[PDB]
Paper text:
Intriguingly, the β4 loop is well defined in the AtPrR1_NAP structure but disordered in the AtPrR1/2_apo structures. These structural differences suggest that the loops are somewhat flexible, and act as a switch to control the binding of NADPH and release of NADP+. Similar conformational changes of β2 loop and α10-helix can be seen by comparing the structure of AtPrR1_NAP_ + PIN with that of AtPrR1_NAP and the structure of AtPrR2_NAP_ + PIN with that of AtPrR2_apo.
Pinoresinol/lariciresinol reductase (PLR), an NADPH-dependent reductase, converts pinoresinol to lariciresinol and subsequently to secoisolariciresinol. Here, we present crystal structures of IiPLR1 from Isatis indigotica and pinoresinol reductases (PrRs) AtPrR1 and AtPrR2 from Arabidopsis thaliana, in the apo, substrate-bound and product-bound states. The crystal structures were captured in the apo, substrate-bound and/or product-bound forms. We found that, for all 16 structures we solved, each enzyme adopts a similar head-to-tail dimer conformation, strongly suggesting that each PLR/PrR functions as a homodimer, consistent with the literature that TpPLR1 exists as a dimeric entity in solution. Each structure contains a head-to-tail homodimer, and the catalytic pocket comprises structural elements from both monomers. β4 loop covers the top of the pocket, and residue 98 from the loop governs catalytic specificity.
Numbering used by the authors:
A (entry chain A): 9 to 91, 98 to 129, 143 to 263, 272 to 317
B (entry chain B): 9 to 93, 99 to 129, 140 to 264, 273 to 317
């Protein structure tokens, strides 16, 4: 059994990673930070982990030696901050000091920063820490269910902004599926010290294709305001990354080999399609 | 169907009240505040309520007329601030008074009767009375998540590992209630004619427990005796330099020092609620 410490386990992605690690059969440790000890929902979430067999390990980002003691107990560290640069770098320093970690999987929110955005990867390299990066897809909770409307995570009402012509291919993935891929890949010899691209073919969609999925489920056409590229840029760092995705098509402008793509490496994961994802909000 | 607006529906108690309101068949409205829109947990929670039949009503505590418009749509307003983020509740009262249509207001007091400084604690109740707003108060019990699961220790919701502070002798009766049960009592009482303009006491008999009895339940569940430090009333007060409510509950016995009638006690009024006992509550921590 691979021993895995999940950092950020009360986050949106982190709590799905804990569940996926338990389901995959890893011996799963969850960092229990002091600050969330007074949050009743986060305490009951951690207790739902325990009842499924996870071990809670106490430590905090402000206590370097507590981070060292947590990572000294496992083979793999998985980090998911959706729920930050200094914090990942504090983890990197603790991992380097501990010396025992076989693989570190920092979450990058599915966003490849090598295309300074590179500070965490540069510290991983300089520390000699083995790793796997999972990149290449927008999380459906943040870009899909809102029809990619900025400034809101709620489903659309009658109107939407269409970015450019909405004909640029984006890659969407359910966070539940990103968590399964993380749990599958973290002891896969094929992905040690590799970038793994998450590109589920059925979820390669232009913004207009995503909109049309919504319109078909609600049986009604949305009012549309088209936002040109320079009208977008004249209204200004995620805003910059959003532009790279929806106007320059950075998630789809290069090919990926089967030996480095998540759905090919892990074809047992039946990833949720965006029509099934959006069905819940209609 | 009684129409109910729940204010604080992404909070701890408040999300349980929304659930119990839907369970009861109330036409359930939930205030959707702009400030939770950055929080995916909160957004998906509210969308879960909408999926179950709730109505989301956009409004903000800093926008008086948005609150008036919200309360003008319902018969009953329930508010619960535990886990959200006296002024907020007073803003709600102002909007209810101006709206004029609300048949009953149920402000959560976190189980703590403020009528036992005194005038600051009574500020909301005084504004309710001055506005002529009809109400139901629910009081008399410690929420188990905050006083039971942690064996009444400070600074954590987890039970201790091998050491407990015992207050006084731990022989003062306290009343404990599961937050889930508080929410069901709230949903059942809010259109009960019997509780209009009443204080309803929540006193589940099996959950009237001294702190030592509560510790003993945990020691039996774990099969280990805890190391005990006894804290006198004088030392507790000296270290205060919420703790005041704590002192009155665990040292003065203010939850159990008076009798309540059946016609004003939640488990008599609503005997269909099978309230959770503390042995069952604590087992999830083992």
């Amino acid at each position: 059994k691979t021993r895995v410490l999940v950092v950020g386990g009360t986050g949106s992605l982190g709590r799905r990673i804990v569940s996926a690690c338990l389901a995959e059969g890893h011996e799963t440790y969850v960092l229990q930070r002091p600050e969330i000890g007074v949050d009743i929902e986060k305490v009951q979430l951690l207790l739902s982990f325990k009842r499924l067999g996870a071990h809670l390990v106490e430590g905090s980002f402000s206590d370097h030696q507590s981070l060292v003691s947590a990572v000294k107990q496992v083979d793999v560290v998985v980090s998911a901050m959706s729920g930050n640069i200094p914090v990942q770098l504090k983890l990197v320093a603790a991992i380097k000091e501990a010396g025992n970690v076989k693989r570190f999987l920092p979450s990058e929110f599915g966003m490849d920063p090598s295309r300074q955005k590179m500070e965490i990867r540069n510290a991983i390299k300089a520390a000699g820490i083995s790793h796997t990066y999972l990149v290449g897809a927008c999380f459906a909770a943040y870009f899909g269910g809102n029809l990619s409307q900025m400034g809101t995570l709620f489903p659309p009402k009658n109107k939407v902004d269409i970015y450019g012509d909405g004909n640029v291919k984006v890659v969407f993935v359910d966070e539940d599926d990103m968590a399964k891929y993380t749990a599958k890949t973290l002891n896969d010899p094929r992905t040690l010290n590799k970038t793994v691209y998450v590109r589920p073919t059925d979820n390669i969609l232009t913004q207009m294709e995503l909109v049309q999925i919504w319109e078909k489920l609600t049986e009604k056409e949305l009012e549309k305001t088209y936002v040109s590229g320079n009208d977008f840029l004249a209204d200004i760092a995620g805003l910059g990354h959003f532009y790279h995705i929806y106007y320059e098509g950075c998630l789809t402008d290069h090919e990926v080999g089967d030996d480095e793509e998540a759905t090919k490496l892990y074809p047992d994961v039946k990833y949720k399609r965006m029509d099934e994802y959006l069905k819940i909000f209609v």
